[PDB]
Design a protein around this ligand. Structure first.
Ligand SMILES: Cc1cn([C@H]2C[C@H](O)[C@@H](COP(=O)(O)OP(=O)(O)OP(=O)(O)O)O2)c(=O)[nH]c1=O
Ligand SMILES: Cc1cn([C@H]2C[C@H](O)[C@@H](COP(=O)(O)OP(=O)(O)OP(=O)(O)O)O2)c(=O)[nH]c1=O
Ligand SMILES: [Mg+2]
Ligand SMILES: [Mg+2]
Lengths: 198, 198
C-alpha cells in the first residue's frame, strides 16, 4: 500500500525544457481555479528554503549543492503529487519524473553529481515508486528548440540562471526528447506533444 | 494514511552511542531468529552502496558528503522500519530517530552540514512523519561513557572510523542523553536504560 493511494483526481503533468513556457501555459486554466487544482511554479520554493536559496547555491557550486538541491526538488514534487484535494482535475508544472529522468541524469553525466550522490538519489526514487502513489494520467509536453528556450530564459532574467549555457539546454532537450517522445525511460504513459515555439 | 500502516509487529529499537555495543547486544537474540525479525548492523550498507563507501567519504570530506550520507542512512532506516515480516517481534539496531536527533543535529552544530543541507534533511523527516509509518514500541538505550565507547571503537578498528576523536563521541553522548533521558525532543516512546559499560 502506498501513501496517497486512491486520493488523487485525474492528474495532468506539464513538462518541457527550462523556459519552454510551462507556467505561461498553466496561467490559462487560472480562471477555472475553483474546479481544477493548479500547482505551478515550484521554483519559488527552491529559491527560498527558510531564507536559503538552493537554486542559486546549486548553480554556483554544483559539486557540493546539486545533491541537496535535487533531493529538495524531489521532496517538493512528491509533496505536490500527494497533496490532498477535492477538485476533479489536477494539473502540475513539472513532476518527480522530469527531476529524475532529465535533471538528475544530466547532472550525473556532466559530473555535477558524484556517483555516490547519484546512487543515493536513485535509491530514494526506487523506494518512492514502491511506498508512495504518484498519480500520472496525462503529460503535456511543451516541445521547443534549445534556442527559443534560451531566449525566454534570458528575457525572464532570473539571477540564478544568468550563467546557464546553451549546451546545457541542448542536453536537457535531448533528455526530454528521449523520455517523452522516444520513451527511453519507464513512463511516457499518455503524452500530448505541443509545439511551444509560439 | 501512511505506508506500512498496521503491518508492523511489536518493535524494539536498540540505541546507544557509537561502539556502545548495540550489535553485540543483538547477537543474543540470534537463536530466536525464526521468531523475531532481527535487523542489525546497518553500517554494512553504508560502507558499500553499489561499490561506493559512503561512510568513508563522509568522514574524509564532511562538508560535501555528510548530506548524501545522512540522506542514505535515513533511506535505509526507513526501509528497515517498513520492511514486511510475519514474526510477532521486531528488533532493530538504530533507527531513523537517532539519525535525525543525534547525528544530523550534531553535524549541523559542527558545521559539517550547511544550513541548506540541514533544512533539506529536516523537511524530508517532516514529510516522512506524515507519509510513512514508523513502528516504535520500545527503545533499549545502551548507556555508556564516551571513554568506553572510544575504546571499543578502536578495538573494532573500522578503517573509516580511524580518525574519530573523543570529543565527537562526547557530543553524540550528550545528544543521546538529551533525547533518551532528559527528553529535550520529540519522543513519547518508552525507554529502558541499560548500563552498557560491561
Ligand atoms: C525540475 C527541476 C528544475 N531545475 C532548475 C532548472 C531551472 O533553472 C529551474 C526551473 O526550471 P523549470 O522546472 O523548467 O521551470 P521554469 O519555470 O524555468 O520553466 P517554464 O519557463 O517552462 O515555466 O530549476 C533543476 O535544477 N532540477 C530539476 O529537477
Ligand atoms: C545512525 C548513524 C550512524 N553513523 C555512523 C557513526 C559510525 O561511524 C557508524 C556506525 O555507528 P552506529 O550506528 O553507532 O553503529 P555501530 O555498529 O558503530 O555501533 P555498536 O558498536 O553499538 O554496534 O555510522 C552516522 O554517521 N550517522 C548516523 O545517522
Ligand atoms: Mg515556470
Ligand atoms: Mg553495530
Amino acid at each position: 500500500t502506498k501513501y496517497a493511494e486512491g486520493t488523487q483526481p485525474f492528474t495532468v503533468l506539464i513538462e518541457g525544457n527550462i523556459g519552454s513556457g510551462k507556467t505561461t501555459y498553466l496561467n490559462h486554466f487560472e480562471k477555472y481555479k475553483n474546479d481544477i487544482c493548479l500547482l505551478t511554479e515550484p521554483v519559488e520554493k527552491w529559491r527560498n528554503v527558510n531564507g536559503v536559496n538552493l537554486l542559486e547555491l546549486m548553480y554556483k557550486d554544483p559539486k557540493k549543492w546539486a545533491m541537496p538541491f535535487q533531493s529538495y526538488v524531489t521532496l517538493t514534487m512528491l509533496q505536490s503529487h500527494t497533496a490532498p484535494t477535492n477538485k476533479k482535475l489536477k494539473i502540475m508544472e513539472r513532476s518527480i519524473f522530469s527531476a529524475r529522468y532529465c535533471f538528475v541524469e544530466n547532472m550525473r553525466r556532466n559530473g555535477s553529481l558524484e556517483q555516490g550522490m547519484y546512487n543515493t538519489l536513485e535509491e530514494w526514487y526506487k523506494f518512492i515508486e514502491e511506498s508512495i502513489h504518484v498519480q500520472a494520467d496525462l503529460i503535456i509536453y511543451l516541445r521547443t528548440s534549445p534556442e527559443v528556450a534560451y531566449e525566454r530564459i534570458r528575457q525572464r532574467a532570473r539571477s540564478e540562471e544568468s550563467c546557464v549555457p546553451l549546451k546545457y539546454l541542448q542536453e536537457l532537450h535531448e533528455l526530454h526528447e528521449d523520455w517523452l517522445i522516444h520513451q527511453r525511460r519507464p513512463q511516457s504513459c499518455k503524452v500530448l506533444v505541443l509545439d511551444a515555439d509560439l
